Design an enzyme around this catalytic site. Structure first.
Site, PDB file in Angstrom:
ATOM      1  N   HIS A  61      32.159  45.375  28.739  1.00 17.41           N
ATOM      2  CA  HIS A  61      32.633  44.925  29.936  1.00 17.41           C
ATOM      3  C   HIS A  61      34.277  45.146  29.651  1.00 17.41           C
ATOM      4  O   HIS A  61      35.014  45.614  30.696  1.00 17.41           O
ATOM      5  CB  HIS A  61      32.226  43.605  30.129  1.00 17.41           C
ATOM      6  CG  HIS A  61      30.882  43.474  30.316  1.00 17.41           C
ATOM      7  ND1 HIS A  61      30.223  44.050  31.451  1.00 17.41           N
ATOM      8  CD2 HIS A  61      29.849  42.644  29.690  1.00 17.41           C
ATOM      9  CE1 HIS A  61      28.942  43.880  31.386  1.00 17.41           C
ATOM     10  NE2 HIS A  61      28.575  42.795  30.052  1.00 17.41           N
ATOM     11  N   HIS A  91      42.000  39.492  25.672  1.00 16.55           N
ATOM     12  CA  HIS A  91      41.608  40.741  26.274  1.00 16.55           C
ATOM     13  C   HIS A  91      42.319  41.226  27.896  1.00 16.55           C
ATOM     14  O   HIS A  91      43.147  40.194  28.218  1.00 16.55           O
ATOM     15  CB  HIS A  91      40.036  40.471  26.818  1.00 16.55           C
ATOM     16  CG  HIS A  91      39.609  39.587  27.714  1.00 16.55           C
ATOM     17  ND1 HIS A  91      39.170  38.478  27.500  1.00 16.55           N
ATOM     18  CD2 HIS A  91      39.701  39.841  29.335  1.00 16.55           C
ATOM     19  CE1 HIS A  91      38.948  37.651  28.474  1.00 16.55           C
ATOM     20  NE2 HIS A  91      39.151  38.421  29.747  1.00 16.55           N
ATOM     21  N   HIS A  93      41.993  43.446  32.025  1.00 13.83           N
ATOM     22  CA  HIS A  93      41.590  43.842  33.237  1.00 13.83           C
ATOM     23  C   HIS A  93      42.214  44.885  33.759  1.00 13.83           C
ATOM     24  O   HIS A  93      43.732  44.614  33.988  1.00 13.83           O
ATOM     25  CB  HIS A  93      41.044  42.812  34.279  1.00 13.83           C
ATOM     26  CG  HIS A  93      40.295  41.573  33.661  1.00 13.83           C
ATOM     27  ND1 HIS A  93      39.023  41.688  33.866  1.00 13.83           N
ATOM     28  CD2 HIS A  93      40.629  40.470  33.141  1.00 13.83           C
ATOM     29  CE1 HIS A  93      38.433  40.431  33.362  1.00 13.83           C
ATOM     30  NE2 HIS A  93      39.554  39.831  32.958  1.00 13.83           N
ATOM     31  N   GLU A 103      43.395  40.490  38.925  1.00 15.64           N
ATOM     32  CA  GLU A 103      42.539  39.781  39.611  1.00 15.64           C
ATOM     33  C   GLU A 103      43.263  38.729  40.433  1.00 15.64           C
ATOM     34  O   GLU A 103      43.063  38.442  41.625  1.00 15.64           O
ATOM     35  CB  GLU A 103      41.396  39.082  38.295  1.00 15.64           C
ATOM     36  CG  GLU A 103      41.032  39.888  37.422  1.00 15.64           C
ATOM     37  CD  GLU A 103      39.624  39.144  36.601  1.00 15.64           C
ATOM     38  OE1 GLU A 103      39.753  38.192  35.777  1.00 15.64           O
ATOM     39  OE2 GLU A 103      38.523  39.826  37.072  1.00 15.64           O
ATOM     40  N   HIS A 116      44.748  38.152  29.635  1.00 17.48           N
ATOM     41  CA  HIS A 116      44.089  36.768  29.232  1.00 17.48           C
ATOM     42  C   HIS A 116      44.027  36.329  27.832  1.00 17.48           C
ATOM     43  O   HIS A 116      43.332  36.893  27.099  1.00 17.48           O
ATOM     44  CB  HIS A 116      42.981  36.713  30.124  1.00 17.48           C
ATOM     45  CG  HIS A 116      42.833  36.772  31.513  1.00 17.48           C
ATOM     46  ND1 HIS A 116      41.514  37.287  32.109  1.00 17.48           N
ATOM     47  CD2 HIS A 116      43.723  36.489  32.363  1.00 17.48           C
ATOM     48  CE1 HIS A 116      41.767  36.919  33.408  1.00 17.48           C
ATOM     49  NE2 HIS A 116      43.217  36.838  33.531  1.00 17.48           N
ATOM     50  N   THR A 195      35.965  34.045  35.203  1.00 13.25           N
ATOM     51  CA  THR A 195      35.955  35.006  36.446  1.00 13.25           C
ATOM     52  C   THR A 195      34.708  36.038  36.215  1.00 13.25           C
ATOM     53  O   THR A 195      34.366  36.886  36.902  1.00 13.25           O
ATOM     54  CB  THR A 195      37.116  35.813  36.187  1.00 13.25           C
ATOM     55  OG1 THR A 195      37.557  36.368  35.406  1.00 13.25           O
ATOM     56  CG2 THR A 195      38.247  34.888  36.930  1.00 13.25           C
ATOM     57  N   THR A 196      34.017  36.049  35.076  1.00 13.54           N
ATOM     58  CA  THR A 196      32.481  36.691  34.861  1.00 13.54           C
ATOM     59  C   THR A 196      31.519  35.900  34.420  1.00 13.54           C
ATOM     60  O   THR A 196      31.712  34.637  34.227  1.00 13.54           O
ATOM     61  CB  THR A 196      32.990  37.747  33.593  1.00 13.54           C
ATOM     62  OG1 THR A 196      32.679  36.838  32.333  1.00 13.54           O
ATOM     63  CG2 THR A 196      34.036  38.458  33.487  1.00 13.54           C
TER      64      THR A 196
HETATM   65  C1  BZ1 Z   1      31.900  38.797  29.206  1.00 12.68           C
HETATM   66  C2  BZ1 Z   1      31.911  37.485  28.940  1.00 12.68           C
HETATM   67  N1  BZ1 Z   1      32.951  36.950  29.208  1.00 12.68           N
HETATM   68  C3  BZ1 Z   1      33.004  35.455  29.244  1.00 12.68           C
HETATM   69  C4  BZ1 Z   1      32.217  34.527  27.975  1.00 12.68           C
HETATM   70  N2  BZ1 Z   1      32.920  33.776  26.968  1.00 12.68           N
HETATM   71  C5  BZ1 Z   1      32.411  33.975  25.754  1.00 12.68           C
HETATM   72  C6  BZ1 Z   1      32.762  35.195  24.921  1.00 12.68           C
HETATM   73  C7  BZ1 Z   1      32.886  34.928  23.360  1.00 12.68           C
HETATM   74  O1  BZ1 Z   1      34.150  34.912  23.074  1.00 12.68           O
HETATM   75  C8  BZ1 Z   1      34.396  33.557  22.534  1.00 12.68           C
HETATM   76  S1  BZ1 Z   1      34.618  33.177  27.008  1.00 12.68           S
HETATM   77  O2  BZ1 Z   1      34.317  31.960  27.154  1.00 12.68           O
HETATM   78  O3  BZ1 Z   1      35.255  33.558  25.867  1.00 12.68           O
HETATM   79  C9  BZ1 Z   1      35.333  33.711  28.420  1.00 12.68           C
HETATM   80  S2  BZ1 Z   1      36.976  33.473  29.083  1.00 12.68           S
HETATM   81  C10 BZ1 Z   1      36.936  34.622  30.548  1.00 12.68           C
HETATM   82  S3  BZ1 Z   1      38.136  34.932  31.634  1.00 12.68           S
HETATM   83  N3  BZ1 Z   1      38.008  36.245  32.191  1.00 12.68           N
HETATM   84  O4  BZ1 Z   1      39.532  34.506  30.963  1.00 12.68           O
HETATM   85  O5  BZ1 Z   1      38.070  34.118  32.769  1.00 12.68           O
HETATM   86  C11 BZ1 Z   1      35.405  35.172  30.672  1.00 12.68           C
HETATM   87  C12 BZ1 Z   1      34.499  34.833  29.324  1.00 12.68           C
HETATM   88 ZN    ZN Z   2      39.613  37.822  31.839  1.00 10.15          ZN
END
Ligand code: BZ1
Ligand code: ZN
Length: 257
Positions: A61, A91, A93, A103, A116, A195-196
């Site tokens: 992803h 990470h 986008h 986003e 982020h 957001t995912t």
């Molecule tokens: C691909 C799934 N991504 C999720 C799940 N997550 C678990 C991933 C293990 O890493 C600890 S997460 O809570 O870290 C997190 S933060 C965000 S965002 N875009 O910042 O809102 C999306 C996510």
């Molecule tokens: Zn993100």
């Protein structure tokens, strides 16, 4: 399984995750004329002088950089928060052209990419227990535009050809995150969600006003990666963002006049 294509993208997610049509979803558009200044907010406190990075990975992803969170070493406090939040991963986008990629948007304008940085509330014990509570996480977002190069981003871009496809990882120690921050720390803030998928409603968002600049040869490298696994047809990793959702119930606040 979910993704960003014609037959499995954003407009399909609600069939497996109903909360997609809830009351506090993210991202959203920020209208600068309606936001209200609040003189009771406090400045942000960022302490990253002791951070310990470990590894970098491609998950199908996007790509992620991980840290060791068994002790307070890199934390976030102040601002609209009460308590201490510990850093775990970062990470990005991005898009297929310089005119789309982020986003969140500002007065309807889109930037080339968005970064982020993710943190959890220590009063809950660990990470898994925290995502099940209304005030469990705190995420800091920063915009990217195309101009001159950013020196501190180079070490990340030079390791990408060793993690081209899904399921690959490599060692990544002694990287300092203080090199990706802009000059000013003025911001906007509101309550929302991830957001995912699973799209849980556990986040307090904090978005910075001043963007950072990167060169065209650097963002070019991001677009050479793959969504697929080794030994399978090639699909390039581009346009991995969710568009703006309804505001409904909320109000946005600013720390600057
Ligand atoms: C691909 C799934 N991504 C999720 C799940 N997550 C678990 C991933 C293990 O890493 C600890 S997460 O809570 O870290 C997190 S933060 C965000 S965002 N875009 O910042 O809102 C999306 C996510
Ligand atoms: Zn993100």
């Amino acid at each position: 399984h979910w993704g960003y294509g014609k037959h499995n993208g954003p407009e399909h997610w609600h069939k497996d995750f109903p909360i997609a049509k809830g009351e506090r979803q993210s991202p959203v558009d920020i209208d600068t004329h309606t936001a209200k200044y609040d003189p009771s907010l406090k400045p942000l406190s960022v302490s990253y002088d002791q951070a310990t990075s470990l590894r970098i990975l491609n998950n199908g992803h996007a790509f992620n950089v991980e840290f060791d969170d068994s002790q307070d070493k890199a934390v976030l406090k102040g601002g609209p928060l009460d308590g201490t939040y510990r850093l775990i991963q970062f990470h990005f986008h991005w898009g297929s052209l310089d005119g789309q990629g982020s986003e969140h948007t500002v007065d309807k304008k889109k930037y080339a990419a968005e970064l982020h940085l993710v943190h959890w509330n220590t009063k809950y014990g660990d990470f898994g227990k925290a995502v099940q509570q209304p005030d469990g996480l705190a995420v800091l977002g920063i915009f990217l535009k195309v101009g001159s190069a950013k020196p501190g981003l180079q070490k990340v871009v030079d390791v990408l050809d060793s993690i081209k496809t899904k399921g690959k990882s490599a060692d990544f120690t002694n990287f300092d995150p203080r090199g990706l921050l802009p000059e000013s720390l003025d911001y906007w803030t509101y309550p929302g969600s991830l957001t995912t998928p699973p799209l849980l409603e556990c986040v307090t968002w904090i978005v910075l006003k001043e963007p950072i600049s990167v060169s065209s040869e650097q963002v070019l490298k991001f677009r050479k990666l793959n969504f697929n696994g080794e030994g399978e047809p090639e699909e390039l990793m581009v346009d991995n963002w969710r568009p703006a959702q309804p505001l409904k119930n909320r109000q946005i606040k600013a720390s600057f006049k």
